[PDB]
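Predicting holo structure, 1KQ bound.
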Amino acid sequence: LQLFPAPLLAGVTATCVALFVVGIAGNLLTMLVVSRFRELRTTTNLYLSSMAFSDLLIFLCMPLDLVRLWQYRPWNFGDLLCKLFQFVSESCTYAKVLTITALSVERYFAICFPLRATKGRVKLVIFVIWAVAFCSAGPIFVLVGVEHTNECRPTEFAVRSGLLTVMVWVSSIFFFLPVFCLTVLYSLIGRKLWRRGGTTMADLEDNWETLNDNLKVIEKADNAAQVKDALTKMRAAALDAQKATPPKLEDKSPDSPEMKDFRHGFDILVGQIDDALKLANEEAQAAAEQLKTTRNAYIQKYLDQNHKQTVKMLAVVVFAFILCWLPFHVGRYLFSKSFEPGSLEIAQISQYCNLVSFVLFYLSAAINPILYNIMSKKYRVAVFRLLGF
Amino acid sequence: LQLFPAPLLAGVTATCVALFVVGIAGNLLTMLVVSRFRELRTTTNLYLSSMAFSDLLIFLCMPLDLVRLWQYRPWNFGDLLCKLFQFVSESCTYAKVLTITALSVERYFAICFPLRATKGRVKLVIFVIWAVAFCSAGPIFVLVGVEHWDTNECRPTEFAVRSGLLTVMVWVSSIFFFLPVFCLTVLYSLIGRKLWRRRGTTMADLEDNWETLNDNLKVIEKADNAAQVKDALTKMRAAALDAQKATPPKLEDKSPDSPEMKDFRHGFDILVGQIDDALKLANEGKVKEAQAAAEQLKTTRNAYIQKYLRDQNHKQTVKMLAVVVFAFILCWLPFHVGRYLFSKSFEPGSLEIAQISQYCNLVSFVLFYLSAAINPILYNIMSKKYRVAVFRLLGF
Ligand SMILES: Cc1cc(-c2ccc3c(c2)CC[C@H]3N2CC3(CCN(C(=O)Cc4cn5cc(C)sc5n4)CC3)C2)ncn1
Ligand SMILES: Cc1cc(-c2ccc3c(c2)CC[C@H]3N2CC3(CCN(C(=O)Cc4cn5cc(C)sc5n4)CC3)C2)ncn1
Ligand SMILES: CCCCCCCC/C=C/CCCCCCCC(=O)OC[C@H](O)CO
Ligand SMILES: CCCCCCCC/C=C/CCCCCCCC(=O)OC[C@H](O)CO
Ligand SMILES: CCCCCCCC/C=C\CCCCCCCC(=O)OC[C@H](O)CO
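Done. C-alpha cells:
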C-alpha cells in the first residue's frame, strides 16, 4: 500500500547506488591500506578493518533492499529472503557495535592504565565478536517474516509470545553500547589526555608532532635560504616538551627520571639547536639530520604518539554511527507507544521514518572511509602510496 | 608499476561490482522471461537468451578478474588460472558474435527473402555456435601465461609471440570483431531499406498498424466501460483503414489489381465493418456484446490476413538489434584500436606509453563488463512486452 511518489523512490535509489559505489570503494581502500603497510597495523586499525568488512557485507545486502523497496507484490519465497537477509544485516550491525566496544575498551586501558601489560589476540576477539553477533541475531531468523504492511517485519508469533520484547532488549543493549563508549570511555580518555605537570599529555603530543614535522619537512623538502624559524619552533616545542610527563614515568616520579629524561632530551635539543642556529645565520641541514637520530634514539626509547587524533576521530566515527541508528530506535519506541490509535497519518509518518532509516543505514556503511580521509593524514598518504614500491 | 591512483582503481572495482549485480540480475531475468512467457519464445529471443547465458558466464569471471587487476597472487597456479579463464572469456565473446551473426542472418532472410521459407533447429545452431567458439578460442589456452617492468597482466607468452601464433590469433580476433560490424552495416541497413520502402505506406507502417490492432484487441478482453471499449475500437478503425493500403510481404512481387490484393484489401473492408458494428454496440451500453463482436474480428483477421503475412514485429526488433550490436562494437572498439596503435607505435617501454596503455586497458576492462550487463537494460528501454514481463517477475 506504499505512498511514495516515483520521483522520491528514484531519488532514494540513486542516492543509494551512489553510496554503494563510494562505500565499496572506500572500505576496500581501508582494508587494503591496513593489510599493506606494517606500521598501520595497530590494534585500533585492525578493528577498523573488521568494521570495513562488515560494511562491505551490508553493501551486498543493498540490492535486495532496493528490490523490496520497489515491490508492490512480494515473492513467494520472499519470506525466507526476509529472514535470512534481516539476520545478515543485523548480524553485521551487532558485529560492528561489538568491534567498536572492543576497540574502545582496548584503547581505554591503553591510556588510563598505561602500566597494564600479543598477536592472534586481535583475531580471537574479532572471531568472538562475529560468533556472538551471529548468536544475538540468530532469533531474527525465526522472529521476522512475511505473513498475509506485507513487509519484512516481526511476525505475529514473535509478538504474542514476548520474543519480540526480548529481541528489542537485545537491540537496545546493542544500541547503548556505543553510546556508553562515546560518552563514558572516550570522555575518560579525554580527561587523561587533558590533565595537568608543566603541560598536559595532549600538549606533549602536539609539541612533539610540531617539532618533528618542521624538521622532517625541511630535511627532505622546502629548501630555502632561511629555515631558522623552523629551528626556532623546534627549540620552543622541545622546550615545552620537557615540561610534560611521559607515560612510562606514570607521573609518580618527582625526580628520578624527571631529572634523567629532562636533562637527556633537553641537552640533545639544546646543543643541536644552538649549532643549527649558527649555521642558519651563515651544513645546517646536516646538523638537523644529526639531531634527528638522537630523537629516534631517545623518543623510541621512552615512548603510540597518535593518542589525540585517534580518540578524536573515533569520537566522530561513533557519533555518526549512533546518529544514523537513532531514528530507527526512536521511531520504533514512539510508534510502539501508539499502535491502533490514529492509524492514518501515523502510518505515513512511520513509512517516512523507515525510509530515512534505510538511507541512514547505507550511509553509515559508507561514511567511515570518508571520515578517515578527512581526518587522518596517515590514511591519505597510505592511499597515495598504496600501489607503489 | 600501477600508473593511476588507488582511489580510481577502487572506484572502478566498485563500479564493476555494481555491473556484476545488474548484469547477473538482468541476464537471469532475460532467461527466465523467455523460458516462462511463451509469446516471448521467438527464434531471436532464444538467441538473445543464449547470449544472456554467455554474459552470466562472463560475470562469474569478474571476481578473479578483479583479483588479477589488483595484482594479488593468492595462489601459485595463476598461470593456469590465466590459460583457463582467458580461454573462458574469449570463448564467451566469440559465442556472442556468432549468435549475433546467426540471429542477424536469420532475421535478414526473414525480411529480404520473405517468399523463401522448428525449435530443434535453434538448439542445434546454438550448439554449433558454442563448438566453433570453444575451438576458435582454444589456442588462447596454450599461448597466454604468467612468467617473468611497467606491465602487469596475464599476457601472450614468448612462445606465442615468436612462433607466429599470436599473429594468427590477432587475425582470428579481428575477424570475429568484424562479423558484427558486417551484421550492423550490411544486413541491418538492407533490412531497414526494405522495411521503409514506399508502395501509400511502408512495410514498417503496416507492422505498426497490425501491432496497434492486436494490442487494442487485448484491451477489449478486459475493458469494463463503454468509452473504454469504444476508445480501443476507435483506434483500431483508424489503424485498419491506414493498414488496408499496405502491400503485404507475401505478396510483394504482385500487381495492385491482383486476386490476392482484392482478398487482402476486401478483408480489411469486412474488418472495418465489424469494428463499426462493435462500436454501435458500445454506444448503446452493450459492453459484453461489443467484446463478443470483437472476437469475430479475430477470426476474420485470422483467415484473410495471416495467410497474406510470420513475424509482425520486424521494425522494433531490428531497431533494438541495431542498438545492441552498436553497443557491442563500441565496447569492443578500444581494445582493438589500442592494440593496433600500440603495435604500430615506434616506442615500447616508455612511461607515457605505459600509462596510456594502462588507462586503455582499464577502460576496456570496464567496457567488457558493461557489454555483459547492458543488453537487459536495452531490452527494458526498448521492448515494452519484455519490460512488462520483467516487472511482473520482479513484482512491480
Ligand atoms: C526482496 C526481499 C528482500 C527482503 C529483505 C528484507 C530485509 C533486508 C534485506 C532484504 C537486506 C537487508 C535487510 N535490510 C537491512 C534493513 C533495511 C534498513 N534498516 C534500517 O533502516 C534499520 C537500521 C539498522 N541499523 C543499523 C545501523 C548501524 S543504522 C540502522 N538502521 C535495517 C534493515 C533491512 N525481504 C524480502 N524480500
Ligand atoms: C587470479 C588470476 C586471474 C587470471 C585471469 C586472467 C584473465 C581473465 C580472468 C582471470 C577472468 C577473465 C579474463 N579476463 C577477461 C579479460 C579481462 C577484460 N577484457 C578486455 O578488456 C578486452 C575486451 C574484450 N571484449 C569483448 C567485448 C564485447 S568488449 C571487450 N573488451 C577481456 C579479458 C581477462 N589470471 C591469473 N590469475
Ligand atoms: C547525491 C550525490 C549524487 C552523486 C551521484 C548520484 C547518481 C549516482 C548514480 C547514478 C546512476 C544510477 C541510475 C539511476 C538509479 C535509479 C533509476 C530509476 O529508478 O529509474 C530512473 C529511470 O531512469 C527513469 O526512466
Ligand atoms: C585504426 C583506427 C580506426 C578507428 C576507427 C574508429 C571509428 C569509430 C566511429 C564510429 C562512429 C560512426 C557512427 C555510427 C553510428 C551508427 C549507429 C547505429 O546504427 O545504431 C543506432 C540505432 O540504429 C538507432 O536506431
Ligand atoms: C537490468 C534490470 C535488472 C534489475 C535488477 C537490478 C539489480 C538492482 C535491483 C534493484 C535496483 C532498484 C530497482 C530500480 C527500480 C526500477 C523500477 C522502476 O523504476 O519501474 C517502476 C515500476 O513501475 C515499479 O513500480
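The pocket of OLC (ligand 5) is lined by residues A 13, 63, 66-67, 70; B 21-22, 25-26, 376-377, 380, 391, 396 (CB under 6 Å).
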